[PDB]
Amino acid sequence: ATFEIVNRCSYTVWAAASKGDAALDAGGRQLNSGESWTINVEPGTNGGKIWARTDCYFDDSGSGICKTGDCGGLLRCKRFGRPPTTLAEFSLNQYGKDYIDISNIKGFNVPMNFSPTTRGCRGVRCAADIVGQCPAKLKAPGGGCNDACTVFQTSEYCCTTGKCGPTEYSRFFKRLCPDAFSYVLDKPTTVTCPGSSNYRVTFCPTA
């Protein structure tokens, strides 16, 4: 499947793509304002994620650091990134269907639209100014808006026991972005697409 990753932000981002234990495609790449990067993701990819990283510095070998979404200091991510990270999430060719969503469960750093480029389903979007409106205790000094689990490490926020309800913090993410997961047991906003759909992830889709 193809994922066109587009940076409409006025600032450079470093796109990242991983399924947790491996890179997807090259795993990461710099995207200046306006640039597009098309990757190929193997059919059947389960638990894939795409995100943006901000304020990165990498050396010649592709080692360095990002202020949000850093994946073990690598330009080419093999692992998931350090919160806060707005997450485009997907599992492909699962009994004939693709499943996509956006998640704020690991916080928010960059606004995002996640849409099919092929027919048969709708896209999802979280493009509200979550960083600007972020509750004081959730603000990440490094940039972005942390989820409450990341900040407070409680069973309730992290849904450790598999029992948890919505919280004041999760309700903030849900208020600004109704179409993204705000906590682990949120009412699913997952979209069912035809198996083997193709997609576009757009950072800052409205700016």
Rounded CA gap, 112 and 109, in Å? 9
| Contact between residue 126 and residue 108 where contact means Cβ atoms under 8 Å apart | yes
Rounded Cα–Cα distance for residues 175 and 170 (Å): 9
Structural domain total, the chain = 1
Give me the CATH number covering residue 85: 2.60.110.10
User: Which residues pair with residue 181 across a beta bridge?
Assistant: 103
Contact 148, 169 (CB under 8 A): yes
What DSSP line would sit under 128-148, residue for residue?
S-HHHH--GGGB-TTSSB--H
Is the bond preceding residue 83 a cis peptide, omega within 30 degrees?
Answer: no
Resolution of the structure, angstroms: 2.1
Give the structural domain span for 65.
Answer: 1-207
> Experimental technique used?
X-ray
Give the up-direction half-sphere exposure of residue 149: CA atoms within 13 A in the CB hemisphere.
22
The rounded distance, in Å, linking the Cα atoms of 35 and 204 is 12
Q: Kind of pairing, strands 48-58 and 87-94?
A: antiparallel
Residue 55 near residue 14 (C-beta atoms within 8 A): no
